[PDB]
Design an enzyme around this catalytic site. Structure first.
Site, PDB file in Angstrom:
ATOM      1  N   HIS A  45       0.836  -1.206   0.000  1.00 38.15           N
ATOM      2  CA  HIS A  45       0.000   0.000   0.000  1.00 38.15           C
ATOM      3  C   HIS A  45       0.871   1.256   0.000  1.00 38.15           C
ATOM      4  CE1 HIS A  45       0.054   0.199   4.562  1.00 38.15           C
ATOM      5  NE2 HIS A  45       0.068   1.503   4.265  1.00 38.15           N
ATOM      6  N   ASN A  61      17.648  10.375  12.361  1.00 37.17           N
ATOM      7  CA  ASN A  61      16.852  11.597  12.531  1.00 37.17           C
ATOM      8  C   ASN A  61      16.462  12.133  11.176  1.00 37.17           C
ATOM      9  OD1 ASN A  61      16.006  14.307  13.003  1.00 37.17           O
ATOM     10  ND2 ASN A  61      17.070  14.253  14.977  1.00 37.17           N
ATOM     11  N   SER A 188       3.945   2.159   8.379  1.00 35.78           N
ATOM     12  CA  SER A 188       3.595   1.138   7.407  1.00 35.78           C
ATOM     13  C   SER A 188       4.823   0.753   6.589  1.00 35.78           C
ATOM     14  CB  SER A 188       2.553   1.633   6.431  1.00 35.78           C
ATOM     15  OG  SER A 188       1.277   1.726   7.025  1.00 35.78           O
ATOM     16  N   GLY A 189       4.909  -0.522   6.291  1.00 32.04           N
ATOM     17  CA  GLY A 189       5.996  -1.017   5.501  1.00 32.04           C
ATOM     18  C   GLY A 189       7.215  -1.421   6.284  1.00 32.04           C
TER      19      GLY A 189
HETATM   20 CA   LIG Z   1      19.271  12.106   9.164  1.00 31.43          CA
END
Ligand SMILES: [Ca+2]
Length: 240
Positions: A45, A61, A188-189
């Site tokens: 999806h 990050n 998701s995933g």
């Molecule tokens: Ca980064």
């Protein structure tokens, strides 16, 4: 991830950030698992939209230079042929992404270990979800990679009427449902990492949560069960 804690930057080196081009920038949309130096496993999806995708490995990050990232375009997308975008509850929420380049492995970039085919975890098995998804229902993405402890909920419980009923299939893994911790949009995933014989393996591909909310009691996060798709995965890689 709702109810997470910040991951240490070398705990989950197979986690990737799947991003799409949006104007002069890139936006995180989903997780994934690096499974070969040039292949990522994610949810079908996640790639329904006709977008330009890239993978970031070695990411911690999303908003700061970590000094460890590698950026690589997605060259081929192979969605499971039985996926139906209309029907996430039918399952088959899995896709493989061939990367334009092979990434370099290091303590921040490693292949995810997949379970043996057919493996089913006992109820209440220890797992962590990881991702940069929303930190609250209807909230915002995390900046730093989050983890949450989500114990599995076996099929018999998860497909009971108080839980997911008919919506969950045996081709899925359920985890969590405590009302506090969960996956959420943007997770998701990505992987569900489960500790088995002393080794974490990626047993799930994050697929869906309740229409009510992310962290909803008795609506555990639902994952595609990786161990149902080992032959599919190997077949795709060997023919591409
Ligand atoms: Ca980064």
């Amino acid at each position: 991830v709702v109810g997470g804690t910040e991951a240490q930057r070398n705990s989950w080196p197979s986690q990737i950030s799947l991003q799409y081009r949006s104007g002069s920038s890139w936006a995180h949309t989903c997780g994934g698992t690096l499974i070969r130096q040039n292949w990522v496993m994610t949810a079908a999806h996640c790639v329904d939209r006709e977008l330009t995708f890239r993978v970031v490995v070695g990411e911690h990050n999303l908003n700061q230079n970590n000094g460890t990232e590698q950026y690589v375009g997605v060259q081929k997308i192979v969605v499971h042929p039985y996926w139906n975008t209309d029907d996430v509850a039918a399952g088959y929420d899995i896709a493989l992404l061939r990367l334009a380049q092979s990434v370099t492995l290091n303590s921040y970039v490693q292949l995810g270990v997949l379970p043996r085919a057919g493996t089913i975890l006992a109820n209440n098995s220890p797992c962590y979800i990881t991702g940069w998804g929303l930190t609250r229902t209807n909230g915002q993405l995390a900046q730093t990679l989050q983890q949450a402890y989500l114990p599995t909920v076996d099929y018999a419980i998860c497909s009971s009427s108080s839980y997911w009923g008919s919506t969950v299939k045996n081709s899925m893994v359920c985890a969590g449902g405590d009302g506090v911790r969960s996956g959420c949009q943007g997770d998701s995933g990505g992987p569900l990492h489960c500790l088995v014989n002393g080794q974490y393996a990626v047993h799930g591909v994050t697929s869906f949560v309740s229409r009510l909310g992310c962290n909803v009691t008795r609506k555990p996060t639902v994952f595609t069960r990786v161990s149902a798709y080992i032959s599919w995965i190997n077949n795709v890689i060997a023919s591409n």
